[PDB]
Amino acid sequence: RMAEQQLYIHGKFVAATSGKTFETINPATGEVLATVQAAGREDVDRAVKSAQQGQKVWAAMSAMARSRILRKAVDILRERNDELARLETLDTGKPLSETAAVDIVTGADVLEYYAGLIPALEGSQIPLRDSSFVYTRREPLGVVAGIGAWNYPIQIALWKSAPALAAGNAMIFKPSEVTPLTALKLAEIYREAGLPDGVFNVLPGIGAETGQYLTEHPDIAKISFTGGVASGKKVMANSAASSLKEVTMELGGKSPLIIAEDANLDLAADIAMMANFYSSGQVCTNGTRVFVPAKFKAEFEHKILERVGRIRAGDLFADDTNFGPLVSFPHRQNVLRYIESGKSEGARLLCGGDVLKGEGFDNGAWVAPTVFTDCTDDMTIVREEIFGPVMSILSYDDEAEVIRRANATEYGLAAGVVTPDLNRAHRIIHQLEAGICWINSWGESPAEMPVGGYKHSGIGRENGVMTLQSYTQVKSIQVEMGPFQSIF
Amino acid sequence: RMAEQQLYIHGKFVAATSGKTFETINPATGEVLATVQAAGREDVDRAVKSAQQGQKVWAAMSAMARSRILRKAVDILRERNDELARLETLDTGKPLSETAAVDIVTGADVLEYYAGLIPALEGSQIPLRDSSFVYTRREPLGVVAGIGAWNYPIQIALWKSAPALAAGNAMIFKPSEVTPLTALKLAEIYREAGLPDGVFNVLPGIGAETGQYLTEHPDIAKISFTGGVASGKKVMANSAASSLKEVTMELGGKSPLIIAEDANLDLAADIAMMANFYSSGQVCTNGTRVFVPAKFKAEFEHKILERVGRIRAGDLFADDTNFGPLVSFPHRQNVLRYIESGKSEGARLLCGGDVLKGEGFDNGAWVAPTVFTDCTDDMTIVREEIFGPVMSILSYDDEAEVIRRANATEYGLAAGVVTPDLNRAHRIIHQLEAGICWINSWGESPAEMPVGGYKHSGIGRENGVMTLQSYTQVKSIQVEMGPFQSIF
Amino acid sequence: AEQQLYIHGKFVAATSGKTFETINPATGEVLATVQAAGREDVDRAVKSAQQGQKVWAAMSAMARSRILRKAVDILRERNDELARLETLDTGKPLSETAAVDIVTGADVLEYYAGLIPALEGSQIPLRDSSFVYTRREPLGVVAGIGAWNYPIQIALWKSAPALAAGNAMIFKPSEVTPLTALKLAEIYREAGLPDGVFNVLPGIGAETGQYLTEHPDIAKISFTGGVASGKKVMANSAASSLKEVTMELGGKSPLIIAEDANLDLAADIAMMANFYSSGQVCTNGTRVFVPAKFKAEFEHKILERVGRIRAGDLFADDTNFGPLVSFPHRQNVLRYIESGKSEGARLLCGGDVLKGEGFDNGAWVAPTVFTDCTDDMTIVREEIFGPVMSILSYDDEAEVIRRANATEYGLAAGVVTPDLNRAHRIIHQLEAGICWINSWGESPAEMPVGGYKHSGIGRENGVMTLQSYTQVKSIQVEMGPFQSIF
Amino acid sequence: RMAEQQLYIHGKFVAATSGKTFETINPATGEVLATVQAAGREDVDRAVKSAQQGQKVWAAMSAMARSRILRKAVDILRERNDELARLETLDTGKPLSETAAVDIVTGADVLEYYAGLIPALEGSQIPLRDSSFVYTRREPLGVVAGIGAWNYPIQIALWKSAPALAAGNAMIFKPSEVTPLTALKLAEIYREAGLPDGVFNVLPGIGAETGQYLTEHPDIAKISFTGGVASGKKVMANSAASSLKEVTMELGGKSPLIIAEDANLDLAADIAMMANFYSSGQVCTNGTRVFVPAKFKAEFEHKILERVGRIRAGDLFADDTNFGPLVSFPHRQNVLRYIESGKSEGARLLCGGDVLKGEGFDNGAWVAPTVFTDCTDDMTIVREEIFGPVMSILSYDDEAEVIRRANATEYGLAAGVVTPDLNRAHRIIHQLEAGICWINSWGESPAEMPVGGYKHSGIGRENGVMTLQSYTQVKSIQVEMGPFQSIF
Ligand SMILES: NC(=O)c1ccc[n+]([C@@H]2O[C@H](COP(=O)([O-])OP(=O)(O)OC[C@H]3O[C@@H](n4cnc5c(N)ncnc54)[C@H](OP(=O)(O)O)[C@@H]3O)[C@@H](O)[C@H]2O)c1
Ligand SMILES: NC(=O)c1ccc[n+]([C@@H]2O[C@H](COP(=O)([O-])OP(=O)(O)OC[C@H]3O[C@@H](n4cnc5c(N)ncnc54)[C@H](OP(=O)(O)O)[C@@H]3O)[C@@H](O)[C@H]2O)c1
Numbered sequence A, B, D: 001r002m003a004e005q006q007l008y009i010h011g012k013f014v015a016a017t018s019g020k021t022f023e024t025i026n027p028a029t030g031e032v033l034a035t036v037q038a039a040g041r042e043d044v045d046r047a048v049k050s051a052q053q054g055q056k057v058w059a060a061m062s063a064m065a066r067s068r069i070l071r072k073a074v075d076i077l078r079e080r081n082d083e084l085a086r087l088e089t090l091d092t093g094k095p096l097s098e099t100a101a102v103d104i105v106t107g108a109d110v111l112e113y114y115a116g117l118i119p120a121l122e123g124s125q126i127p128l129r130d131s132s133f134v135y136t137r138r139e140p141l142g143v144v145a146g147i148g149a150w151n152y153p154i155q156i157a158l159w160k161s162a163p164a165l166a167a168g169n170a171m172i173f174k175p176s177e178v179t180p181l182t183a184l185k186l187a188e189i190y191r192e193a194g195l196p197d198g199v200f201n202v203l204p205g206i207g208a209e210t211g212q213y214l215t216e217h218p219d220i221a222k223i224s225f226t227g228g229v230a231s232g233k234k235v236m237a238n239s240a241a242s243s244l245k246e247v248t249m250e251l252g253g254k255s256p257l258i259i260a261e262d263a264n265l266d267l268a269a270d271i272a273m274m275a276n277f278y279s280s281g282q283v284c285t286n287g288t289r290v291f292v293p294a295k296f297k298a299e300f301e302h303k304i305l306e307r308v309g310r311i312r313a314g315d316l317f318a319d320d321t322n323f324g325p326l327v328s329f330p331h332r333q334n335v336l337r338y339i340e341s342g343k344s345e346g347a348r349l350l351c352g353g354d355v356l357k358g359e360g361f362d363n364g365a366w367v368a369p370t371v372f373t374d375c376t377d378d379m380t381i382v383r384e385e386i387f388g389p390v391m392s393i394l395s396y397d398d399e400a401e402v403i404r405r406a407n408a409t410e411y412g413l414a415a416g417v418v419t420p421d422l423n424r425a426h427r428i429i430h431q432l433e434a435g436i437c438w439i440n441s442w443g444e445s446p447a448e449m450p451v452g453g454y455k456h457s458g459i460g461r462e463n464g465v466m467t468l469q470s471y472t473q474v475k476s477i478q479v480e481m482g483p484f485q486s487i488f
Numbered sequence C: 001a002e003q004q005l006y007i008h009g010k011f012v013a014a015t016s017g018k019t020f021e022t023i024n025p026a027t028g029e030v031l032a033t034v035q036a037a038g039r040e041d042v043d044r045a046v047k048s049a050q051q052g053q054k055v056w057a058a059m060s061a062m063a064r065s066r067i068l069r070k071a072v073d074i075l076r077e078r079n080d081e082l083a084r085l086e087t088l089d090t091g092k093p094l095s096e097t098a099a100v101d102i103v104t105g106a107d108v109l110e111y112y113a114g115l116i117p118a119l120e121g122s123q124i125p126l127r128d129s130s131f132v133y134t135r136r137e138p139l140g141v142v143a144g145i146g147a148w149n150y151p152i153q154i155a156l157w158k159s160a161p162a163l164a165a166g167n168a169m170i171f172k173p174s175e176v177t178p179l180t181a182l183k184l185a186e187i188y189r190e191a192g193l194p195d196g197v198f199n200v201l202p203g204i205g206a207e208t209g210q211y212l213t214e215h216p217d218i219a220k221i222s223f224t225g226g227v228a229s230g231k232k233v234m235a236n237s238a239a240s241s242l243k244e245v246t247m248e249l250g251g252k253s254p255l256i257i258a259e260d261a262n263l264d265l266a267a268d269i270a271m272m273a274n275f276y277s278s279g280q281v282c283t284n285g286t287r288v289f290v291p292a293k294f295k296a297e298f299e300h301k302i303l304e305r306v307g308r309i310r311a312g313d314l315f316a317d318d319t320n321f322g323p324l325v326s327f328p329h330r331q332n333v334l335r336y337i338e339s340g341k342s343e344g345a346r347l348l349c350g351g352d353v354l355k356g357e358g359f360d361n362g363a364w365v366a367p368t369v370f371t372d373c374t375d376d377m378t379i380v381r382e383e384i385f386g387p388v389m390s391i392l393s394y395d396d397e398a399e400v401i402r403r404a405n406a407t408e409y410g411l412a413a414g415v416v417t418p419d420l421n422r423a424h425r426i427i428h429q430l431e432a433g434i435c436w437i438n439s440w441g442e443s444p445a446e447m448p449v450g451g452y453k454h455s456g457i458g459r460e461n462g463v464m465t466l467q468s469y470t471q472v473k474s475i476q477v478e479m480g481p482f483q484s485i486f
């Protein structure tokens, strides 16, 4: 075990006053990684009062002073990339080959990006007439809250905290109870970089208690949430009933990958693989509906199976391991229920469909890489997000058909097309109802690129210049230099 | 008495299938203006299918073709200004001296503004490397819904529909049951201007039925709401619980007007009057907490009393009338309950405080212009929005005190300061927690100026370039021209 | 009667005592005698512009927007009348002038009218006690100098952003094509533009154009024309009074036909890239690079399409090819055609004046195509500004990029290919400001256009050009106590 | 005396091939600081070919890779601040109290600012119709040239090279022959930070030879020039005659300082001192026309005299020295001719008017702090930039007059007003024809704030986001996905 994990409030670790704890499990072994204290209602109020004090100090600094502090945190994150990745691997089950290459690297990339943009955050000036003009300030919201998910814990903490801090706010962050550990490390790193006390506080806890207290607190101006649709609805509802808050939500999806009639099938299979089996399928943007032309289906299926042969499950710290267990045993039970529904509805199982067995697997939350084919639009595994390593392959005949079927979903997060044809690529992409679209690739999410969902996949965006601005609020100021006229 | 008012769906009036109606009255006389049909659940669904069909036509046109149609609607609104003002006066009770100068004029100003901006709505292009780049599209949300309030019915309809339509969306608009008539005229005007059938549908009805159906419909992408906090919470809950929707809300406030120690008291009194008694106090941005230095309070009160004597209640179509009844008898009752709480909590009644009586008043929802003084921060009339003609005068001593008291509220809509001093004006305004700030004036809301609330006074903004962008959704598109690498 | 100057909302006699003649290039007859603005006329126009600019800038943004939109409405109403005049003055067929010249000029005015209210400064917080805000102020009086190939379009593309940004503009049309600019000045006044905000000074470049470039109270010059005159303008502006200068100077733009291109599509693009306005378009794709394996078939497709060109009565619905703008310009184009023959280019079609009844009296040059061209030929290196296409064989993609870029010009370029990677990959490597994929010639009001290298300075159209007609004033408000070290 | 200084081309010092040298003088002693090689026509061509090669390497890197390299150069500049400040003091005569606090600090501030903005440099995307769209790229110009002035040598070098490099260009920089030394140090620092060889080359030389060779070279795409009007005309002419190049110029001015009738005269005097005698009056933005109300003129003069009496001329490396000699003895001769013209034209000499004398001054190019009063608008010292420590005080009666007289100049660089009144401050500033305006202050030039001249004081701007964009050129790209129609 690790030492008991405490709350992080005002630049130090502190015990919760709730009397409550929870355990985070190592999904490779089933053993308790750490006992973690859960923030109660009083702890949340302490954190808000801490955040209000730190935010004022932070906002009073110059823009470049803030930039330098966030840049110092970047420098530390680069220095400690491997240490943090190992902790993320223990907490999440994702292979070290992923966490050491992606999770901290791309989280720190977004922090570095926003650090450089702070001096460029500007309001406007609007002349009305010789005797009057308007100017605007992009002011901090104040205290904002982030609620993270368990698939990319520190990356999510960085993608929410970076624009929030760069915009002059304090953020209170609640990591998922499944994966609370790296967020506490991030808090220490920020303070070491010189972040003022209270500007980034971390409250581990359960969604139903700590998360609810955050969403209900009257002095929190904005909630940013990553997770599933079901929890998103609770968060949105509670934020409205209790105290009005701006809200950002990234909620996953059922993203379609469209393989065109002129696609190279090796390229198409490589993209489909990376869109389904990275992080053991636990990625919001995964292309879990793979639409393949009927004329290519059989050959595509054989290419996918060949690549499934390249998946290497094993020791998560071994260099050649590229597939992990799922994040938790309850999550695995849910994925197995989806797989069983696929079988009972007649989807054709090409590989996988069961847990992994044997030495080194019996005690971990492993699900084999699973591919179904001959899938149809009404199947449960086609309609619902599984968030495991389960690819659904669907045949199609014509371009208008596949666009309709790709869009006939309540989800809207990502989409992609594989085609060498100029007109086909742009023409199809422009008709797809998704916020993140990839042409002849999958998964790259540059700091510069706004990402978020259409329809039930989200509200608002993350990354890009617009997200820095979305963590400010506009104040419009009219200077009236002429004589004021009253009609009374 | 007008003919029975029908729903407006797909470029024509159509009967509701709900079997339900309501009546709108003239609040100055109690006479029934019209029987109005109320949209049922099936009517809403028909309106959404109409909007989906029209939106596709509208979005496929060129940007300048859309601009020209909205400009033609501006032209018609200018020509019919006085006619529409008369109807608005009948429906709302606001004096014709206001409705003919403000309501349609500023609503049409915003439509005119956005009409010219359609061709400037652009995405971005982000170079990643020689072999890859990103571009973004600002795509229409699709079908959006607007929910109006009764204090500025046609202006609210124009401020919501103008950016929504200019961004390429269709809007379904539900006016308040208290004041449904001008929204129906607006629907006819848009069709006359060449707006494609279905792009602006109008569904009169009750909030508890028609409004809820709109917030719950799965194919509406965004709700924009103007009204009170209680109804906003209901709207937010239903919009999230049913189908995730973007949400904008303007919810009123308790805005402070700060008279500085160096202010001219004639200017201060004129601003305070215009900040409290325009539209009979039924304005979201009204400066209903008037902070006056103790050394000036008695003279300030005398100047307010002089100006209150100039308030001219009477025939709403007479040019010199500058004060009307409240919009409804239920609303006047709420204002009267607040007046009674002010008296019972020890506030000093400076003037007013009762219903108006006599010929021309007995049948209308008239309340005398009312001023309380000797107020303290804990009184109900100081803490809560009244939305009638009730000014609360508070004394203060020093600048730090007045800033703290001005900000000690859950609301955040507007604020203002009266001072000739350069440093004092900008220094105080920058510390106030409000989205709309006026220096040496009150009430002007240019089309260019984003307006909306901090804290519990709202979510999002209206007007300005940013609100056009807020009625689009960003699609990010990565073009990968290099070879894609899979780790499988 | 002589056509007069337009100063302060009325036609007024020049004080120069000087005139020139504009010719109808289809007949050689004098279309009109036009007065030429002298140095005193320029000074009068500047004082008029200074007075009108102050009125115009004091109006609200939306008031300015409405006035420019009224001018758009008048241009739409008078489209056909103005097009007939442009045809008389320029020789371009009415099928062109009535479809493009006023239509696209008015498109740009309409665009900027709607963008005026969006012209905003910025606000920068420095610290609690100080902030900066900026204003985008008008330059004041600006000058535009037009060319003869698109006279009223050029007047509108220059005046629209200048006026929308709150400036007055003094506009000098080319002496070859002065008439439509004078009609535009009347239309602006009719729309409610304040007197002096748009003045028109016909004259010669060597006199009126020089006087404008030298005047001390003109804040900016925007110039369209040739490189030779562009240097003269730049030289005179430097000697006299510091001014911002924007320039669009033509080019030798390459059209790259890829190995996977459909040759009917490529030939159609090549035709529109070379023979619209009788080849008198700055952005024309006059170096057509064709894969060697496609060359013979492409040449046949070009020969078929060139043979179908309908030269004739400029007001006839089916005419799609006109004479050149002037007889001196025709002589210059014929010298280039002769250099192509004498330097060993193979003449595929055309190469001479058109002859016979209906052509003998006009400045006609046949649509002309050379092939077997090489990069050292004069017709390949120098802008001809007539209907002269140069077809060049190439073997490899890297080769054609080198050759496309091996020019001092940089105005436009294009590629014909159905391949996603090829289209973007090639375009990103071309050194040109205006790039077309599987098309040619469309110039949306939203799209900034201008040249790399010797093809220009600055841009026209797009939001950025509205801003380029303002100057930034930065204003710091210091609310804290100022510290002096003395 | 230092070693002979070489050219800096392609990441190393290299001998000039011109066979020519020049000397830079220490203006405090008259001694030769160094012999410096002068770049010839062949040396410029070699530097251009070096720059073309390095620029391609630099532009091919990621935006953030470039950001990190420029940030490393910032880090080195901070560490070497005192070393560089001392060299600048020796070369320019400016007190170390200035060079160690302002010159490198604000030069590095601008580099740090642009380093963070590189990832935010974006093109646009414009939808035309379903079958066609436009996108733009902001491409590097290629090789650009900067020509520096002698009053702020390393700051000018940083203010030009920072946006040029951040936009992806290589820059060839020619420092003034009076002050060539710190630009050579900067070149070494860029290489140490990882700037690719050739991206920043430095060519000392004479304006008439090296500068002209740069302005004439056919493969240089843009010239950025700081200096006087006379040389700016030479640069403009030669740049046009040779090869069309974008040219940016900052050319000094005769900037007005307007003291309002309600101004505190101690504040006004302090502002006037800082606007005239910093860097011994050798500042482009100096407020050398000080407009004072007639009723306050005598008292203002008495306040200026006391403050002039506190000026501490002496050892330039002593902490309490705040006034230095002029940059050169030829420049002093020109300033003394202006002073004599003031005397002969009837201006009243309030103080100074001569060189400083005595031990420690006889060998330096010192001019006493000089104030003229009773000045008139036709006087030479009022109309022409002196670039020495010479203040002209002009009386005025009313606001409309002083605005007219402030604007009655061919120059337009800066301006300021001193007033506590809100309306007066904004009203006056909005009417002044200058690009840089200060209210109740003088001299601060934040990296965020675009700076440059109206009228004869310059073309284009420096600093601010816009200057980064001005070092790119726009490429517009239309994608036509529909069938192209030819009319032939
Ligand atoms: N970029 C383009 O779209 C464009 C347009 C036309 C021509 N060109 C090229 O230019 C070549 C020469 O044609 P051109 O000589 O008729 O055109 P040009 O001289 O470049 O005409 C451009 C404009 O500059 C004016 N101008 C001439 N000398 C001037 C001076 N010293 N100061 C100020 N303004 C001056 C001209 O006045 P006047 O015409 O009254 O003398 C005209 O208004 C053509 O063969 C073609 O290659 C390019
Ligand atoms: N705007 C400012 O901040 C500033 C700065 C300094 C001076 N000035 C003004 O300029 C006046 C004259 O001083 P100055 O003559 O020493 O300054 P200057 O000539 O304007 O110096 C500016 C720069 O231009 C270079 N230069 C000169 N002639 C050139 C040419 N033909 N082509 C290219 N580059 C050329 C100079 O090189 P060399 O020095 O090697 O000859 C120097 O690097 C001063 O009295 C003052 O009013 C203004």
Ligand code: NA
Pocket (backbone or CB within 6 Å): A024, A025, A026, A027, A033, A090, A091, A092, A178, A179, A180
């Ligand atoms: Na865990």
Ligand code: NA
Pocket (backbone or CB within 6 Å): C022, C023, C024, C025, C031, C088, C089, C090, C176, C177, C178
């Ligand atoms: Na003519």
